[PDB]
Nucleic acid binder design. Structure first.
Ligand SMILES: [Zn+2]
Lengths: 144, 189, 55, 101, 143, 139, 81, 120, 72
RNA sequence: AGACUCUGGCAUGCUAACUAGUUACGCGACCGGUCGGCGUAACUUCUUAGAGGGACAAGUGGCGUUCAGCCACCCGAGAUUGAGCAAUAACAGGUCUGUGAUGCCCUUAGAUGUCCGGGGCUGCACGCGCGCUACACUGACUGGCUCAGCGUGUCCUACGCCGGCAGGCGCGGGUAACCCGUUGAACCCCAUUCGUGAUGGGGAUCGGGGAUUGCAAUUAUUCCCC
């Protein structure tokens, strides 16, 4: 019965890690949390007041699945149709600074290190926290 | 055993008319959990009489320019409509579809005979395969118009129109559109 | 013209610095893979260069 | 002497494999360690063009293609053997690239 | 959910017929010079729940909403959220509201007419001023 | 004690690996119930419910689908699981079990065991796609 | 010191149409009537060993009106690999 | 007149990099890229024409073919003939005039007047 | 005719919410918006409170179609 | 015409891979499970691309002037795709404006030659053809999830740093299944909000600012933000 991150519902994974960082208290909150977009192809504001936390949860599980990926790769994860108006839509990448200040703050919380052969990967320390939240939400799903 | 969406049984569904015995879909053998089988049912003629009717409704309901390829967004509407039909009728929701396509399937229709610009109709009867095919599209178009311009959703409208067609009431678009064809075929015979 | 002002315009950027190596014409140029051939002189030397219209 | 690499490249396979089966046969009678010719993918240089040289016709197009087949054959032998194997079976239309160490 | 006995239906703030029978986020879109984005940022700086409707606000809430949009810089609003950046006359960062939009637009139109520019003449003639093609379009508004 | 087969649709290609085990069928690490189109989850459930858990209790399946889109991926897992169990009960188990499993799956659906022979038609000039053409006018 | 030119004779001069088509050009340029030199080339390459051949000369042959002239004998394959 | 919080005197006596600091993006890019050799000879000539003018009489019209010139605040009041393609035009260079390009003031086309269409 | 609805509750609407809703046999925000002349968002927000009070069973919840059933 | 040639569906038979992949073992890392996370044993199922095989109205039942062949069925991957090439005879069809192809020519020194500066080809009352966005609820917003294929690239770009974006700086790789890239594409899948309102649908028009490419963006070149 080894609970793995891959054995847990990813949507239920990312909504069970934003509250984990709120009670932690330690996180680098940027100035542009209540201010800015998340991509150039975005027209409205995120509804959540804590969108920067689930962004970090999604980034953490993405580095868990496939490590050694930089900020330009996270621009390609969170891209989408850039409705160009009357012109047909196209592919657009995400913002390269919000994901930057997520990854750069992940070293501040000691899950992520800059590996010698490229971008950023996960330390063996945060895998424990990931499997703990995985086990607790898996028990919450499988028990009640 | 094999249920529709794992919960609805089609084995307790009875076909009423002899005219729709072999051209109707599943009674005992064509039972599938989902419509979405992605089989080839248009390669040869009379290969459409062997697909399940959930496939036929799913394929007919996706008819508009905005959603012409989408299908996984179409099976959920049918599933929700089936739940609503089971809520209202109190019994197996698939019998309601049969009783609705029986009362909506046209029997007599006209034929364009003459020159262009002046129609001179003559009544001919409706083939059973076309009888099966025609009743679904009218349901789909009525649901399209109604749920196109009200608050009421696609699944709720499809379910209510299907139940009113099973009852054979005149408040349903399916039972309405059989009547014009029937009475124009009455005028010629 | 005058020596200081005869080729005074730079000829690195713009399609007027690119001409076909066969006919010196600059409309319909194939710069893909460095052919630099006119699209109408290409159909002349396609068989000789080693191009085969297989399908 | 190790990791001596021979790369055959040409345009058609009716002449590529005729030579590719020749140098691997010369090394076999010399009792050397041979690695089989691994296929390195065919490149389809595809150029579409208008047939009409004035642009008046019914918009008909030519899909000209070049096909490039690549071969990689590996040996493990001193460098004087690969030269005498390559230099004898010279065939036009198929060309050889030799990388040492 | 509650039934507000004290529920003002139709607001009249800054001489604009504001509809309180809507979300507060998209009711401030109705005034000129403020769209969805600026209203959303202003209300997020005002710490107002977006679930709340426009007619559910208190008096001090309406007053602080008005005072935030007037001078945005001290209320943690960046300089690139504004309707006009550094202008020709003063070069001052300022957000333009409904009342200032009309007379600022007419003085912008009349600025280039004394200048006698290509854009000023194009504006004066009713033609497209952005280099646009009206050989086949622009039939609307013409004869 | 192991066989390796592949299932295929339009572009997706799932490879299964039948090692003897305890009954764990995971697709690239995540379980069967967990593939992102949830409705077609019932589609991913249609082999097992037709074959029973009692013949899956000694089999572990590792599905390695890499290609296709979001739906052609599921049918590759479908095909690979079905033909993987067929090959596993062919090489090591007597032919009668393979034949009855094959008969049951065939009388359910033929595409559950054989591959779709239809793939994309090449686009041609003068049209938007394969067979469609551009608009034409008259005098 | 890297190029070596070597002039060589054709294995069959008549059968190679690249060398042959430049002979009729020189024959027309020399002042011959078109039809006679075309028959000369035609019978030379028919006797050379070909299964079939054709020569099409087009232009202002006998007037300001441009007619077309065609000499076909033997076999021909106009389509197929 | 006041241009971006700045009157004409501080506009006239100020430096080139701060003049860049006042202008907008295209003008700043054009200043940072650098005025060219042909554009440098117009500056001295328009200084010469303004210098030899009477203090009451504004300096004479000078023809040029450089429609892409940004009007510096040192160019205010100098009459410059701008080529429209066929002829030259007389434009008055105002203190407000500095933010634009010369070519938009010498109109290249003629305003379109429409007549009855002939078999169209 | 034009459709004018109420974003918030009314005196008669909340009374109809308590006594009429558990006998519809179909409880849908569209039906509430049709019968009670209110916005469909308000119907969803009231049905969430009705679920929280434990008087209505939920059959299927989704982005668009949410299916409710009366208790027993 | 057909045959042919290329492409597609099939081969658990063949060829052989450190510039492709799997399995095993070991090393770890986490809680017997996961690792695109690391290395050597094999190995060619997945990936490559070459040979050979395979499908023919082949078998069966009807129809048949019981010939030629036509409907239906078993087995099979396929009972069969999509293109290239395309005869005789023609057209006053388009192209001298693709050629240092071209006959008669016109001009040839204030040139119909060359080059340069600027403008124009895009100018607008109106008409005619493609094409793209939409008209909203099967929808839009936001968050999360999760899969390709041609096929370019000495310019393609990874990664790190500053910026809200557009962008800028440094250090790299790749003349290429070696790097971009396991091409974390979109539609689609789940959740939130909006609920028939010219509405947040849809962004035509117009101001202001910012950055890049270019000698030169004035006739908004583009791209970004209200
Ligand atoms: Zn070329």
């Amino acid at each position: 019965p080894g609970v793995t991150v891959k054995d847990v519902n990813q949507q239920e994974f990312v909504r069970a890690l934003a509250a984990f960082l709120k009670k932690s208290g330690k996180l680098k909150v940027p100035e542009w949390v209540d201010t800015v977009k998340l991509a150039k192809h975005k027209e409205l504001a995120p509804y959540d007041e804590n969108w920067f936390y689930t962004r970090a949860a999604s980034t953490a599980r993405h580095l868990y699945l496939r490590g050694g990926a930089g900020v330009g790769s996270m621009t390609k994860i969170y891209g989408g149709r850039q409705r160009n108006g009357v012109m047909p839509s196209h592919f657009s990448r995400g913002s390269k600074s919000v994901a930057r200040r997520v990854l750069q703050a992940l070293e501040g919380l000691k899950m992520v290190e800059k590996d010698q052969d490229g971008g950023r990967k996960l330390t063996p320390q945060g895998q424990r926290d990931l499997d703990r939240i995985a086990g607790q939400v898996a028990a919450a799903n499988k028990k009640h | 055993d094999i249920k529709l969406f794992g919960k609805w049984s089609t084995d307790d569904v009875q076909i009423n008319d002899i005219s729709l015995q072999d051209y109707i879909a599943v009674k005992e053998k064509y039972a599938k959990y989902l419509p979405h089988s992605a089989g080839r049912y248009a390669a040869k003629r009379f290969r459409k009489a062997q697909c399940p009717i959930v496939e036929r409704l799913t394929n007919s309901m996706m008819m508009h320019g905005r959603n012409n390829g989408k299908k996984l967004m179409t099976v959920r509407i049918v599933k929700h409509a089936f739940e609503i039909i089971h809520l209202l009728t109190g019994e197996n929701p698939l019998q309601v579809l049969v009783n609705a396509i029986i009362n909506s399937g046209p029997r007599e229709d006209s034929t364009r005979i003459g020159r262009a610009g002046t129609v001179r109709r003559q009544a001919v009867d409706v083939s059973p395969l076309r009888r099966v095919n025609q009743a679904i599209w009218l349901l789909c178009t009525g649901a399209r118009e109604a749920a196109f311009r009200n608050i009421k959703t696609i699944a709720e409208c499809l379910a209510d129109e299907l139940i009113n067609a099973a009852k054979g009431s005149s408040n349903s678009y399916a039972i309405k559109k059989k009547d014009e064809l029937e009475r124009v075929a009455k005028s010629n015979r | 013209g005058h020596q200081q002002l005869y080729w005074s315009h730079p000829r690195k950027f713009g399609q007027g610095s690119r001409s076909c190596r066969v006919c010196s014409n600059r409309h319909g140029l194939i710069r893909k893979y460095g052919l630099n051939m006119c699209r109408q002189c290409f159909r002349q030397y396609a068989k000789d260069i080693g191009f085969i219209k297989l399908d | 002497i190790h990791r001596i690499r021979i790369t055959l490249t040409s345009r058609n396979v009716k002449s590529l494999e005729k030579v590719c089966a020749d140098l691997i046969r010369g090394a076999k009678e010399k009792n050397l360690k041979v690695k089989g010719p691994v296929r390195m993918p065919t490149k389809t240089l595809r150029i579409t063009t208008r047939k009409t040289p004035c642009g008046e016709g019914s918009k008909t197009w030519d899909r000209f293609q070049m096909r490039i087949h690549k071969r990689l054959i590996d040996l493990h032998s001193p460098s004087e053997i690969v030269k005498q194997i390559t230099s004898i079976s010279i065939e036009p239309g198929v060309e050889v690239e030799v990388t040492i160490a | 959910l509650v039934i507000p006995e004290k529920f003002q239906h139709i607001l009249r703030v800054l001489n604009t017929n504001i509809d309180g029978r809507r979300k507060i986020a998209f009711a401030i879109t109705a005034i000129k010079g403020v769209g969805r984005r600026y209203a959303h940022v202003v209300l997020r700086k005002a710490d107002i729940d977006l679930t709340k409707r426009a007619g559910e606000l208190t008096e001090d809430e309406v007053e602080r909403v008005i005072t935030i949009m007037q001078n945005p810089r001290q209320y943690k609003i960046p300089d690139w959220f504004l309707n006009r950046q550094k202008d020709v006359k003063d070069g001052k960062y300022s957000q333009v509201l409904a009342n200032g939009l009309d007379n600022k637009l007419r003085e912008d139109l009349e600025r280039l007419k004394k200048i006698r520019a290509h854009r000023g003449l194009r504006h004066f003639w009713g033609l497209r001023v952005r280099g646009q093609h009206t050989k086949t379009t622009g039939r609307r508004g013409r004869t | 004690q192991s066989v390796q087969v592949f299932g295929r649709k339009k572009t997706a290609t799932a490879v299964a690996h039948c090692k003897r085990g305890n009954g764990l069928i995971k697709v690239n690490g995540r379980p069967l119930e967990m593939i992102e189109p949830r409705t077609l989850q019932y589609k991913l459930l249609e082999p097992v419910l037709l074959l029973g858990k009692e013949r899956f209790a000694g089999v572990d399946i590792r599905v390695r689908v890499k290609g296709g889109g979001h739906v052609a991926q599921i049918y590759a897992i479908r095909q690979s699981i079905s033909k993987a169990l067929v090959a596993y009960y062919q090489k090591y188990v007597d032919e009668a079990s393979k034949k009855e499993i094959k008969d049951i799956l065939i009388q359910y659906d033929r595409t559950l065991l054989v591959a779709d022979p239809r793939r994309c038609e090449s686009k041609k000039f003068g049209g938007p796609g394969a067979r469609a053409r551009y608009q034409k006018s008259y005098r | 010191g890297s190029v070596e030119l070597y002039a060589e004779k054709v294995a069959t001069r008549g059968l190679c149409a690249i060398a042959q088509a430049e002979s009729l050009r020189y024959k027309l340029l020399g002042g011959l009537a078109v039809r006679r030199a075309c028959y000369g080339v035609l019978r030379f390459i028919m006797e050379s060993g070909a299964k079939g051949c054709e020569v099409v000369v087009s232009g202002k042959l006998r007037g300001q009106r441009a007619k077309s002239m065609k000499f076909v004998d033997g076999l021909m394959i106009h389509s197929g690999d | 007149f006041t241009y971006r919080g700045v009157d004409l005197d501080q506009l006239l006596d100020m430096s080139y990099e701060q003049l860049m600091q006042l202008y907008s993006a295209r003008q700043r890019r054009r200043l940072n890229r650098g005025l060219r050799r042909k554009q440098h000879s117009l500056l001295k000539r328009l200084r010469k024409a303004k210098k030899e003018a009477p203090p009451m009489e504004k300096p004479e019209v000078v023809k040029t073919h450089l429609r892409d010139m940004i009007i510096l605040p040192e160019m205010v009041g100098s009459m410059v003939g701008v080529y429209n393609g066929k002829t030259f035009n007389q434009v008055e260079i105002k203190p407000e005039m500095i933010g634009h390009y010369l070519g938009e003031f010498s109109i290249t086309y003629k305003p379109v007047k429409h007549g009855r269409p002939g078999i169209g | 005719d034009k459709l004018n609805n109420l974003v918030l509750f009314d005196k008669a609407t909340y009374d109809k919410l308590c006594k009429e809703v558990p006998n519809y046999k179909l409880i849908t925000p569209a039906v509430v918006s049709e019968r009670l002349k209110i916005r469909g968002s308000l119907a969803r927000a009231a049905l969430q409170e009705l679920l929280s009070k434990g008087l209505i069973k939920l059959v299927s919840k989704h982005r668009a179609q949410v299916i409710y059933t009366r208790n027993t």
